């Protein structure tokens, strides 16, 4: 794993990667 | 809220895994 500030895009790719086929979901705030 | 521990520091892959189930 590389260390990252992980915002945005980068944290929903990276949840791609962690959660694997599992999915996951993201909470955004308008 | 965990998304702000990820933006404004490093969440590791333990921290990521809480995002999903």
Same mark, same amino acid.
């Given at each position: ?30 | 809220?965990?998304?702000?521990? %990820? %933006? ?14």
């Amino acid at each position: 794993f590389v260390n990252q500030h992980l915002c945005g895009s980068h944290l929903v790719e990276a949840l791609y990667l962690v959660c694997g086929e599992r999915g996951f979901f993201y909470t955004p705030k308008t | 809220g965990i998304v702000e521990q %990820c %933006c404004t520091s490093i969440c590791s892959l333990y921290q990521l895994e809480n995002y999903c189930n």
